[PDB]
Amino acid sequence: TREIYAEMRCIPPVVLRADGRNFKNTLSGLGFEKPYDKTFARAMADTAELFIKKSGLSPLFAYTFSDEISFLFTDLPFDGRVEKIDSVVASFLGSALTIKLRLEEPIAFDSRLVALQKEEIPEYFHRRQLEAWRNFVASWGYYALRNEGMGRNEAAKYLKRKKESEIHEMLFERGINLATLPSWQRRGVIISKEAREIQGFNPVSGKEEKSLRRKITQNWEIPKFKSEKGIPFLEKLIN
Amino acid sequence: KTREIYAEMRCIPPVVLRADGRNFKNTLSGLGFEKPYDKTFARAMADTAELFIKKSGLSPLFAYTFSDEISFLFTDLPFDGRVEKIDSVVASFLGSALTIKLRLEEPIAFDSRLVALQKEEIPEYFHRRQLEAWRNFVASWGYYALRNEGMGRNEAAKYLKRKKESEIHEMLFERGINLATLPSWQRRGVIISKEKITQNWEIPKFKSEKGIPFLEKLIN
Amino acid sequence: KTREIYAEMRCIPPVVLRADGRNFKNTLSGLGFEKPYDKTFARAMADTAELFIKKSGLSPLFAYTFSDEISFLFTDLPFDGRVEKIDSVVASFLGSALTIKLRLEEPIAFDSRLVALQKEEIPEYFHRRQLEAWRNFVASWGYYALRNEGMGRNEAAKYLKRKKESEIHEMLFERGINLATLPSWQRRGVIISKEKITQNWEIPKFKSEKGIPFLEKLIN
Amino acid sequence: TREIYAEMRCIPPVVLRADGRNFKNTLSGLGFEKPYDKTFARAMADTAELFIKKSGLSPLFAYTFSDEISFLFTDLPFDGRVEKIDSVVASFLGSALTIKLRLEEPIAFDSRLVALQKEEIPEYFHRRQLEAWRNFVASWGYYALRNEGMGRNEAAKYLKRKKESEIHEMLFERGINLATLPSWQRRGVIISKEAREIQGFNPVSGKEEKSLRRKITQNWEIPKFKSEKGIPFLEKLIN
């Protein structure tokens, strides 16, 4: 037994979180719109969807923003083997993103398992959404500084210093009002399997039919999870 | 977070990472690769290993690949020895690189695992690998020749388990297939290493006269 | 240190710790315990579990013991969920306590393991334990009666594997031993819990009419 | 598989380090001489010896000082299962110490595995011996302060503050010179199996005999490991 981590295991429910490694460098100089490129955001959501459709593993849904994708598993893949889950999921993702963006140089996702109890699941996504807010503010904040001749580390030390209302002020003197930007930049996107009422003509027959069908749907206008609308939304995705 | 409980799982040098293609015979079907071996697939694997040594930012001593697998030797541990990080990032990078080398239309995936070794056991690790390369070589060609006789899928699979290697060899030899002279990379695998990065497609058996100091040079 | 690589291995609540006596039938021989069960040994185990709940500083919800084993339920995780620490300190404390309760002259040892559970699976865990208590009960008495017929060590061991439980029962019944009325603690084990700390030597079967809410009260 | 840590493994060589948990409280008020009780130190060494003799596990040797015992394993017990090694060793130790000291209330050792490479082993014991030095100084230092009407936390904040030459000075104004104390208080004790030349009369025969025999020996006068004498000493114990 020299493969000492190979038997290491988790139990459901579990979230797998995958995060782009150093995308700011490995995707630099490739022509992506700054500070937000909607083609990239589509590729991330499409990557989560491809995983849900073709990976053979069965997550309830995915949640993505910036460079991260979180999957919730109630049914554990590979008998819960941690090395196998982390490596295979991160690998499928690196390959799927590489196909969606037609990359010519390789990228990598990391992966980690988040060990949760059922009742803790909504709070996990609260925290991820709060991080999406913080990344929203930082990405625009950074963008604005750099446009004001700022330097790399200069803008970095800057952002840590001030406060959100402050950074809002600076953003405002550069013509940027964060309340005008699309919901998804600050809230992220949800990808899940859905069943919906379907009434159509059979492609072969072609008789009228109500035989229902399945689809993977991307939701680009999600509520804030920790809110009036958000609580039943999240609990519905989880069951 | 204290919910990321595997995140501090760690390892110590030296370590071997072994990545292995998940279900490639289904997911790479439809590229119409030649049976039972396709040197285009093998160039892609070796190139993938080379791209990793060049551009991953991690510092493996060398790589050893055959079939769907690639082993990397690290004496210098990436990510402070963090297992989840090492396994996930390395499998992900390889998945990205191979997807590029083959310009795939559908996604593939590598798995990944750490092999903990003492410095003195390192040669024996690669010997065990090369021996699995040989065993997989024999089985593939055996399977191929059988199927080409009109053998059924499962039936050929049974024949291979029943008979000994010596009989499969004789069987291949009757039909015009000589295991000893088929290309080296199929029988023994390929070594990718720095000094510039070089792919050695004609390697010695590791526990032979020339093989013993060949491996020690790679390990230093 | 970064060489103490298991030291951050962690777990999340709720958890069950199960400690089990290592090789007691050799190491506690020479105390001349009555076969096949000795209530002095069982008082020592239950007292040991009570001493742990009282004086260990850790906060288990309750304990469940039979044979050489003790299970503890924690919803509040000791040592921030650190596995090496939890397993080592709990097994050590138990080893010390049992060594006191029996005033031993030679050292014994418990092993220890964490059982990761979801809150809803907790009742089923103890049901599986109680079922192992029943199975061990049957096997012990069967072994005892056989040996007392002039059966050989290994031979009695064979008989027990061959025959079904229904036959071992009938066999015990022929000889005057009635499994149904032998003391409850032997058949079902003992529960030790706070409210003051109480040892319940007469517990329900956990998945019966009275058992179902009995377990839920212990779990809260 | 709910026993998720049960398959977790290590490879040789490995050191198991066991440390008394809170002995300062659980052994308080029991009548042990302060700040050093040689009966306690004998019990620790005898406990390591009992482990080496009766546990069935095969460590090359043990090293003990204050409340800790380190075992070096080249042959891994229980197929290298971490939960089993940590629990069983700590348990055997808690029971053996409880027998040696005839305790009436229970104690506990913790246990941790130290994953090492062969060439790293001497340096591990260097560090442990350096910690033995530091504990030597702290135990006497603390003892002296308390005798000078000092308080618990008062003496604690004190010890962290000053330096060894300073603490030596304070020790000196209380009549204490650390160079006069026994080597073992500052260097620890080594317990190992040894073979030695034996010439005696057979207890049964009783003919003169040279048939050699084995013994476990405690060495209470060990060298400093990282020194002229110490280097071949340690390398000899390890091989």
Domains and CATH numbers, chain A: 1-239 (3.30.70.3000)
Cβ <8 Å between B118 and D117? yes
Distance in angstroms (rounded) separating the CA atoms of residues A46 and A238 = 21
Contact present, D43 and D101 (Cβ < 8 Å)? yes
Cβ <8 Å between A7 and D10? no
Cβ <8 Å between D3 and C55? no
Residue of chain C whose Cα is closest to the Cα of A4: C6
Cβ <8 Å between A12 and C117? no
Cβ <8 Å between A4 and B89? no
Q: How far is CA B210 from CA B36, B206, C119, D116, D122, in A?
A: 29, 8, 60, 32, 35
Tokens for C160?
Answer: 């027990």
For this PDB entry, the determination method is X-ray
Cβ <8 Å between C95 and D97? no
Contact present, D105 and D22 (Cβ < 8 Å)? no
Continuous H helices in A33-150: 38-54, 82-100, 121-147
CA dihedral B112, B118, B121, B127 (to 10 degrees): 10
Using a CB–CB cut-off of 8 Å, the residues of B that contact C are 2-3, 5, 8-12, 80-81
Contact present, A85 and A78 (Cβ < 8 Å)? yes
Residue of chain B whose Cα is closest to the Cα of D117: B118
Q: Pick C110's closest partner by Cβ from D55, D91, D98.
A: D91
For chain B, the helix, strand and coil percentages under 3-state DSSP, each to the nearest 5: 50, 15, 35
For chain A, the helix, strand and coil percentages under 3-state DSSP, each to the nearest 5: 45, 20, 35
Cβ <8 Å between A80 and D4? yes
Residues of A in contact with C12 (CB under 8 A): 115-117
* Max Cα distance, chain D (Å): 66
Cβ <8 Å between B112 and A83? yes
- Distance from the first to the final alpha carbon of chain D: 40
Residue C59: half-sphere exposure toward Cβ, Cα within 13 Å = 8
Cβ <8 Å between C107 and D96? yes
Cβ <8 Å between D118 and B117? no
Distance in angstroms (rounded) separating the CA atoms of residues C56 and C94 = 9
Residues of A in contact with B11 (CB under 8 A): 5
Place of tokens 């003509």: A201
Neighbours of chain B (3+ CB pairs under 8 A): A, C, D
Cβ <8 Å between A94 and B90? no
Residue of chain B whose Cα is closest to the Cα of A98: B96
In which region does residue C121 sit, left (phi positive, over 0), alpha (psi from -120 to 50) or beta (all else)? alpha
Using a CB–CB cut-off of 8 Å, the residues of D that contact A are 1-2, 4, 7-11, 79-80
From the list A128, A162, A131, the residue with the least C-alpha distance to A16 is: A128
Q: Pick C116's closest partner by Cβ from A11, A13, A119.
A: A11
Q: Pick A83's closest partner by Cβ from B5, B56, B113.
A: B113
- Distance from the first to the final alpha carbon of chain C: 39
Cβ <8 Å between D8 and A8? yes
- Name the burial class of residue D28, with classes exposed (0-12), middle (13-18) and buried (19+) by CB atoms within 10 angstroms of its CB: exposed
Provide long-range contacts, Cβ within 8 A and 24+ apart, for C199-204: C199/C46, C199/C50, C201/C46
Q: Identify the sign of the CA torsion B178, B182, B184, B187.
A: negative
The whole-angstrom distance between D117's CA and the closest CA on chain B is 7
Provide long-range contacts, Cβ within 8 A and 24+ apart, for A119-124: A119/C119, A120/B3, A121/A13, A121/A15, A121/A72, A121/A238, A122/A225, A122/A231, A122/A234, A122/A235, A122/A238, A124/A15, A124/B3
**Helix, strand, or coil (residue C205):** coil
A5 — phi, psi (to 5°)?
A: -95, -5
Cβ <8 Å between A110 and B117? no
The whole-angstrom distance between D178's CA and the closest CA on chain A is 46
Task: Return the exposure string of D207-237: e unless at least 16 CB atoms fall within 10 Å of the residue's CB, then b.
Answer: eeeeeeeeebebbbebbbbeeeebeebbeeb
- Packing angle, helices A152-161 and A121-147, rounded to 10: 130
Neighbours of chain A (3+ CB pairs under 8 A): B, C, D
- Which of D91, D93, D112 should we substitute to test contact with C (largest number of C Cβ atoms within 10 Å)? D91
Helix (H) or strand (E) holding A70, with range, is strand A68-73
Contact present, B104 and A99 (Cβ < 8 Å)? yes
Neighbours of chain D (3+ CB pairs under 8 A): A, B, C
Residues of D in contact with C51 (CB under 8 A): 106
Residues of D in contact with C83 (CB under 8 A): 5, 83
Tokens for B50?
Answer: 């080379």
Q: How far is CA C171 from CA B32, B160, B190, C132, D203, in A?
A: 67, 50, 67, 21, 52
Strand pairing report for B69-74 and B62-66: antiparallel
- Name the burial class of residue C41, with classes exposed (0-12), middle (13-18) and buried (19+) by CB atoms within 10 angstroms of its CB: buried
Cβ <8 Å between B91 and A93? no
The whole-angstrom distance between B10's CA and the closest CA on chain C is 5
Q: Identify the sign of the CA torsion C119, C123, C125, C126.
A: positive
Distance in angstroms (rounded) separating the CA atoms of residues C98 and C101 = 5
From the list A80, A75, A60, A83, the residue with the least C-alpha distance to A4 is: A83
DSSP state of C204: P
The whole-angstrom distance between A97's CA and the closest CA on chain C is 32
Cβ <8 Å between A92 and B114? no
From the list A86, A83, A100, A14, the residue with the least C-alpha distance to A49 is: A100
The whole-angstrom distance between D115's CA and the closest CA on chain A is 12
Q: Pick B119's closest partner by Cβ from D12, D115, D117.
A: D117
Tokens for B150?
Answer: 């009109």
Residues of B in contact with A113 (CB under 8 A): 4-6, 84
Contact present, D76 and B118 (Cβ < 8 Å)? no
Cβ <8 Å between C95 and D98? yes
Residues of A in contact with C116 (CB under 8 A): 11
Residue of chain A whose Cα is closest to the Cα of C75: A117
- Name the burial class of residue B50, with classes exposed (0-12), middle (13-18) and buried (19+) by CB atoms within 10 angstroms of its CB: buried
**Helix, strand, or coil (residue A213):** strand
- Name the burial class of residue C11, with classes exposed (0-12), middle (13-18) and buried (19+) by CB atoms within 10 angstroms of its CB: buried
Tokens for D116?
Answer: 């090492």
- Tally A–D CB contacts below 8 A: 26
- Which of D4, D8, D81, D83 should we substitute to test contact with A (largest number of A Cβ atoms within 10 Å)? D4
The whole-angstrom distance between C130's CA and the closest CA on chain D is 17
Residue of chain C whose Cα is closest to the Cα of A5: C6
Q: Pick C11's closest partner by Cβ from B5, B8, B11.
A: B5
**How many other C-beta atoms lie within 10 A of the C-beta of residue A90?**
33
Cβ <8 Å between A4 and B114? yes
Cβ <8 Å between D7 and A11? no
Using a CB–CB cut-off of 8 Å, the residues of A that contact B are 2-6, 8, 10, 18, 21, 50, 54-55, 82-84, 86-99, 103-116, 120, 124
Tokens for A174?
Answer: 């550069």
Residue of chain B whose Cα is closest to the Cα of A87: B88
The whole-angstrom distance between A75's CA and the closest CA on chain D is 14
Distance in angstroms (rounded) separating the CA atoms of residues C19 and C23 = 13
Cβ <8 Å between C12 and A115? yes
CA angle C122, C127, C130 (to 5 degrees): 130
Contact present, D191 and D44 (Cβ < 8 Å)? no
